[PDB]
Each structure stands twice: as structure tokens, then as C-alpha cells.
Structure 1
Amino acid sequence: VSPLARSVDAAIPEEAFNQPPTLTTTLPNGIRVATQRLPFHQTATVGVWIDSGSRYDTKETNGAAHFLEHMTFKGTKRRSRIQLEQEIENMGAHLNAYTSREQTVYYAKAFKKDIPQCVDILSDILLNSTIDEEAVQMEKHVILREMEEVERQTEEVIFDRLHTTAFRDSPLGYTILGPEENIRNMTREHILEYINRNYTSDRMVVAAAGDVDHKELTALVEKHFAGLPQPKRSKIILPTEKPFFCGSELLHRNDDMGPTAHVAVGFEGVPWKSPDAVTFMLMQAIVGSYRKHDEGIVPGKVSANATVRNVCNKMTVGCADMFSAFNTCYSDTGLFGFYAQCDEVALEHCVMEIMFGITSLSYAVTDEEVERAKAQLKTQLLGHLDSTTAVAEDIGRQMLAYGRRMPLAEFLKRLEVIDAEEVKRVAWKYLHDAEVAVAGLGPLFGMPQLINLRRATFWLRY
């Protein structure tokens, strides 16, 4: 009867249900088009999402997929390098691209009136690019330089080394750039072979968001993407083998690069379509992140996150400069773990504290911790869907992974019914007493043994 028991208990806000639909169509040649109209915008983002990457390179030509990225902006039959650059500038538009292990993306940002001219440019550079042998030799100097700057961003180097040792027996372990000797001996014939084997109509999605009309985007695509080859099958219906996960360590000791070490640990995860994928997203948020030079308004020593609290109070001074948990999904496997930076003499304490927090998911996590993590996850995910680019990336990425876009209300309904007993079930099945892979760099004299890390995945209490 107390007013303290008549509070407004609205689980999922009504705004989650009153969202504009994402419209989809499949064309005769196999290209898929997907659009969501956001009336409160004057600009728009349109792009092409392709289901190919470094994992679809050959061992002898690892690196052609990234090489092709650069050459796609060097000239066509109807436009030259200079002409392409000037046309974009004269409209005030933007044109970007990136390549990963399983997905490749090209997108543009411009006004509504300039959308057709963007679709024309995207189809041309993707289907009619001239791979001049003379330009292939010039780029070799711009790419060998990028391999030196990438070696200066340490976090990117550590995650590559983590893929190299974990997936030794699969193309999923290849690097995106490729070895040096492959870059030096690259020819235009290696690049054309990658195109003819990977860029087909069944592996491409066109997505848009903003002040966009669906029927008009479906007619422009039907006209400009007609010269796209269809898949050829030689009566071969053989399935792909799931990558094998190797428990191993790969460490670069170096006492001449300062007092800070860098480390990353990984577990075998789950693929996109797994019935347990949502729970892995949540488990990533329970471990969370921390930066010593950017705590915010909550001091780390009194944080609600148990992992942060234990790390900040270690030896009364704190044992980490920063750490963060990650979860990455692929088509047939995944990768779950954490990255960290720390002082030479603090490395052992730091790594073992974060391991202790992951293993707590199987034994002792509380519903207060789960609901704190849920609230943070919702604020970040739902907050990043503001611009037209982030929305378009969400459409395209989901069309390749799931075959559809999940509405916001469905995600929130699936996230709502996950409690502490369901977290314990999933962690007991996948993370408890499991194999781990490790990569590291720097002053590593105090690094734990691989077997120490392997046995920290279970407790002897209980």
C-alpha cells in the first residue's frame, strides 16, 4: 500500500516498438538491397558490403585482398585518378573503404540529390577498375611503408599475433597485409584471380540509410550492377572445415623499449548465429574496461565492477595502466578475451586478476553485477545508432551475418531474460577448464607460465 511499491515499471520503452522498418528486396541476379528511412535527416550514407577478405586469399598470394583495396582508387576506363578525386570534391561527398578477414566495405556520404552519382561511382570502381601493371609497382612503396607504421600501433600488432598462434591451421590466421616477400613479388595476375573467384552477386549487399527511397535505390542498382558475374558450381557441394583452436603462446621479449608490457589472452568463442551469442556480449560487459588516466567521476577503488575494484586496490597502488575485454564473432567460430598494458613488475598480478574475474562467471557472479552490465551495454549499443553511417553499417553487417536485420525490440527481449544462472550455464560450458592462447610484447621477465594461465580457468575451492 506504500507509494514505494507503486513505481512505474516499464521494462522496454514504447519507442523500441515504434521504429521505422528496414525494407529488403532480392534482385534476379542475386544482389540484395536493404534500406531504412530516417526522416529527420538531410544527408545519407550508401555503400556496398561484400563477403570476402584475407581469409579468402591463397597461401601463396596472401595480401592481394588488401592490395586490391588501394588499386580500386587508381583509375577506371571512363575515369582517371585525378578525375575521380575531383568529382567527389565538387559534391562535398566522402568515400571510404576498409578490408578485414571476412568482410570488405565501400561506402559514401553525401546529400540526397547526389545519391545516384554515388551509386554510379561505386559500381564503376568495383567492376571496371584497370589494374595497370605500372601502378601495381608504384603502390609497392606505399604499402611497405604502411607495414612500418602498423608496427608502431601496438594493440593492432598484438591482436594479429593472437590470431597467428590461435588459428595456425586455417586461413583465418593469415594477416590482412601479408608478408613482405609477397608484397614485393605481387603482380596484376594475382589480383585478377582474387576478383574472379570472390566478387560475385551472391556475396554482395547494397545498404542505405537516411532520406532515402527504397524503390529508387532498387532501380539504380539493377541498372549499374548488371555486369556482375554469378556463381559457378562444378557439382561440388562440400562443407568447410571449422578452424581448429591451438592453445599456445607467442612472446616477444624486449628490454629496450620502456617499462610497459602489452599482453592479450583469448578463448574459443561462438559464431554469429549461435543461440548463445547474446550471452557472450553480456559476459564481455561484466568484465568491462578501465583506464588509469581517465576514470571519470567514479573512483576505481569504489567501483561496482568487482574486477576494476580488485585491480585498483592491488598493493594499495593499482596494477594496471589499462585493460579491456573483447568478443569477436566469425562465420564458423569466435574469439573471447582481454587486452592489457601494465608495468614490468606488475604484470603477473594484473593478468591473474582479470583471469579471476572471467572464472567467477562460472561460480559466483551476482544478479547485481548482471543488471549493472546490462544497463551499460544498452546505453552504448543503442547510443551508437545516431548517424546514418553507423546505421548503414548495422544493416549491412547483419545482412551478411544473420541473413536479416534484427529489430531493436527483439534484441532487448532476448537480453531481458538472461539472469545470473544463465550466465553460469554458458560459462561452465565454454570457458571453464578450457584452452587459452596468449600473445605478448615488451619487458616480460615476470610473465606467468602458459600452464599457470591454463589452470586459472578453474578453481579448486568448490
Structure 2
Amino acid sequence: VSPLARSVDAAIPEEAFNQPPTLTTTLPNGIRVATQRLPFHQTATVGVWIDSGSRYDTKETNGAAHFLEHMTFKGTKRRSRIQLEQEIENMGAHLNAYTSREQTVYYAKAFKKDIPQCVDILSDILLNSTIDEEAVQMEKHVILREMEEVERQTEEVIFDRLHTTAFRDSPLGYTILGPEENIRNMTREHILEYINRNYTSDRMVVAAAGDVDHKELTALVEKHFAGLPQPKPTEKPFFCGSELLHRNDDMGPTAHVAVGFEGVPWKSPDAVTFMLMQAIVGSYRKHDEGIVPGKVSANATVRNVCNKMTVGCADMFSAFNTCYSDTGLFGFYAQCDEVALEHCVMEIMFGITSLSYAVTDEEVERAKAQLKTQLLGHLDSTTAVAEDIGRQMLAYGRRMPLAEFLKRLEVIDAEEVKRVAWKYLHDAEVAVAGLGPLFGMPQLINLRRATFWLRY
């Protein structure tokens, strides 16, 4: 009757369904090609995504994966280093690469007419690089300086040490750079052994996005990657509950901390719920805040942190969720004052423990809104789309279209969150890492007994 009950209702807009298709094809040797064409763009992105990283080093040569990333730009059988660099630059293009624990990525940006050349170049440097010993013995300088700098970026060292203390028994523990003595001892044969054990056709996919045609890309891949060799049980990584604390009173008043829980794999049904829980806890910065004061925010965790002792007890905090092929991590990172550390940490643990007892649908819907804004807001440019194509191709064997993600996200309510949390996070093991003025720091047993409430 009343007009206030006549409002338009569209949970999922029509645009979520009216999206261009993602085209897929597998070549005889096992290489997979994926594409999506976007009419509203002039350029394109094309690259290679490889299912290998530092998790596939051996403990004796830990650090070879990352060394190969440098070696591939040093020269090939067809072109010298000067020739290679000038043929990067004279296109007026971009070329990027990086490696991680489980994945390695190379890609370029160009106008359509130069996609062939790009493919060629990519193939070359992936298949035909000359790993000269008298160049390996020089890249050690640059890699050692790179490590030197990396030790100064505190967030990354904290996360590395969290992985170190959480996965003691597994190659997930390994850092990407590798120890110092390994950087000094690295040898051509180690790098070539890594190549000839991991660069097989089943592990590579080629993706593009922008102004691209699937047929020509498939033909180009068939033309250039004909030389890639073809291929010829494992068990779940164990998660250890331990702490690793570096006490230091000569680096100023601020303490850094990270806490972690055991997660779920990429393909797990509950993965989406985990993506949502990360958003329900969210983040905060005291320096830069948007337009909502923390003391009145809709997020209860931020609100509780900002009202502590009337002054508020944190400089920054942010939650995170990371999924791997067979396991995950779930947790948070924080920065706070020496004397605030205790509250700084226990407030957020109370946060995360609430997910299993008392969360309500106002909060769930706020978190859905913010999560959708974030994720759907990134996928604008060709690079983001190509990265998403390749990432999903490796993680799932497919690409999941937007409508599917939205439909699966819609039907999660509070009781479902309160079920999954009760399944994985209530009364669990946790791993801890920290740096700085840690006199305040809580005990490991405190953090572990925090995961349940005696009330209720």
C-alpha cells in the first residue's frame, strides 16, 4: 500500500550478466590459452602465467627460482643483452615480471599490431636464455643489495617470518630470496636443474585482454611454444602453532605484530565465506580516515579500538586472507605503541572470535557492500583483467564469471558465517611474529586461549 514499500529491488544488476565471454582452448602439447575482448579499450595486455615458484626449490638450492627471474633478462641464443634491452625499449611498450611462493608471471602491454612481436620476445626469454656462469657470478652483487633493502620494509619481513614460524616442515616456509650463503654459493647447474624440472607445458597458460582475437593468439602460441617440453603422492602442509619474537629497544616506540590461523585451499567451498570474514573485521589507520570518525564507525572492531582509554590504542591494523593450492593463512597485521600493544592485539582477537558467537546481518551486509566495492572496483584495466584471467585459470582450471561470484556471495547470511568460523577458527592454533619494543607483548597461551569465550 504505502509508497515506502514500492521501492525498486535489484540485488544483482543486469550488467553482471551482460559481460563478454572468456574464450579457452588447449593446444596438443598441453598449453592453455585464454582471452576476453573488451570493446572499450585501445591497447591490450598479453602474458604467460606459470605454476611454479619458491615452493618448488629444493632445500639445498633454496633461492634458485628467484635467481632465474634475473637471469632471464641477461641474454638469449638469438639476441645479446644490448639487443634485448633496445628491443624492449624501441617498441614503446611495458614488460614486467615477478615470482612468488607458488606462481610466476611475465607480461607486457602493447597496441594490437605489436602482439606478435611481444609473444616472440616472451617465448625467447622463457625458452632460450643463456645462463652464463660469468654472469651468474655478477648478479650476486645485485641480489645481495636487493636483500639488504628488503630487510628495511618491515611489513614484508613480518609476513615472511610468519610463514617461517607457521610452516616449519614444508617448502612454504622458504623465503623467495633464499639465505645469504645460498646467494653466494649459487651456480649455473642449480638454475638449469630448476628449469628442467619445473618448466613443463602442463604448468603454463597464456592469457590476454583488451583488443585481442582468440584465433590469432592461439596460432601465435602454437607457432612459438612448440619447443616447450612435455611432462614425464604429496600431502597437506602441517601448520605449527608457535611464536617468533625479535625484541629490540633501540628502534623507537613502535611495535609490529602479525597473527595467523590455518585457512582453506583455493577450491574449497568455504573460500568465499573466508573472503567475507576478512572484510567483516576490516582495517583502520589513525593518520588517514576518509569521512567517518572511527569512534562512530559501523565496524564494531574499529569502534572498540578507537575508544580504548579514550585515546585509542593502535596506529594501524588490517586483516588478510591468503589461499594456496592445498592450504591457506588467515589473520591480521598491526602497528602500535609500546604501552598499547596488549590492548592493540587483544581487541582484534576479540573481533575475530566474535565471528563465531554474535555477528549480525547489519555487519554482514556492510561487509558484503565493501567487499563488492573493492573487488568489482579493481577490474577496470586490461592488466587487471589479464592477471585475473591467468590467476583463476591456474587456481581453478577455469575463469569464474562475475554473475557466478555475485550469486554465490548473495546467499551467505549470518548463520553461515557463524557456522564456518565455528568450523575453522574457534579453539584453533595460532602463529605469531613480531618486532620491536615487545615488553608489553602477550603470551602465546594468552592468544591461544583467546580463541574461545567462557561466556556462553
Q: TM-score, normalised by structure 2?
A: 0.99
Q: Distance in 2 between matches of 1:343 and 1:11?
A: 43
Q: Distance in 1 between matches of 2:112 and 2:91?
A: 11
Q: Distance in 2 between matches of 1:142 and 1:13?
A: 51
Q: Distance in 1 between matches of 2:152 and 2:255?
A: 14
Of 187-196 and 73-82, more deviation after overlay is shown by 73-82
Q: Distance in 2 between matches of 1:92 and 1:7?
A: 52
Describe the SS at the equivalent of 2:440: coil
Q: Distance in 2 between matches of 1:21 and 1:312?
A: 46
User: Aligned pair count?
Assistant: 455
The CA deviation string for residues 87-138 of structure 1, in whole angstroms up to 9 with x for no partner, is 1211110111000000000000111111110000000000000000000010
What is the deviation of 1:214?
0.2
The CA deviation string for residues 385-443 of structure 1, in whole angstroms up to 9 with x for no partner, is 00100000100000111000000000000000000000000000100000000000000
Describe the SS at the equivalent of 1:440: strand
Q: Distance in 2 between matches of 1:41 and 1:112?
A: 11
Describe the SS at the equivalent of 2:339: helix
Q: Distance in 1 between matches of 2:219 and 2:259?
A: 48
Given the alignment, which residue of 419, 427, 441 partners 1:425?
419
Q: Distance in 1 between matches of 2:345 and 2:430?
A: 13
The CA deviation string for residues 220-261 of structure 1, in whole angstroms up to 9 with x for no partner, is 000100000000xxxxxxx21100000000000000001001
What is the deviation of 1:204?
0.2
What is the deviation of 1:342?
0.3
Describe the SS at the equivalent of 2:18: coil
**Corresponding position of 1:358:** 352
**Corresponding position of 1:393:** 387
**Corresponding position of 1:34:** 34
Q: Distance in 1 between matches of 2:174 and 2:151?
A: 16
Q: Distance in 1 between matches of 2:168 and 2:321?
A: 20
2:215 aligned with 1:215: yes
Describe the SS at the equivalent of 2:438: coil
What is the deviation of 1:373?
0.1
What is the deviation of 1:84?
1.1
Q: Distance in 2 between matches of 1:252 and 1:218?
A: 52
State, as a whole percentage, how many aligned pairs show the same letter.
Answer: 100
What is the deviation of 1:210?
0.2
**Corresponding position of 2:68:** 68
Q: Distance in 1 between matches of 2:22 and 2:211?
A: 13
What is the deviation of 1:311?
0.4
**Corresponding position of 2:100:** 100
The CA deviation string for residues 335-365 of structure 1, in whole angstroms up to 9 with x for no partner, is 0000000000000001000000000000000
What is the deviation of 1:85?
1.2
Q: Distance in 1 between matches of 2:285 and 2:79?
A: 48
The CA deviation string for residues 152-183 of structure 1, in whole angstroms up to 9 with x for no partner, is 00000000000001000000110000000001
Describe the SS at the equivalent of 1:172: coil
**Corresponding position of 1:193:** 193
The CA deviation string for residues 247-300 of structure 1, in whole angstroms up to 9 with x for no partner, is 000000000001001000000000000000000000000000111111110000
What is the deviation of 1:218?
0.2
Alignment of 1:43-442 (within 5 A): 43-231=43-231, 239-442=233-436
Moved over 4 A (4+): none
What is the deviation of 1:331?
0.6
The CA deviation string for residues 32-67 of structure 1, in whole angstroms up to 9 with x for no partner, is 000000011111100000000000000000000000
What is the deviation of 1:82?
1.1
What is the deviation of 1:80?
1.2
Q: Distance in 2 between matches of 1:314 and 1:85?
A: 56
Q: Distance in 1 between matches of 2:381 and 2:75?
A: 30
**Corresponding position of 1:235:** none
Describe the SS at the equivalent of 1:39: coil
Q: Distance in 2 between matches of 1:197 and 1:148?
A: 30
Q: Distance in 1 between matches of 2:158 and 2:214?
A: 42
What is the deviation of 1:77?
1.0
Describe the SS at the equivalent of 1:47: strand
Q: TM-score, normalised by structure 1?
A: 0.98
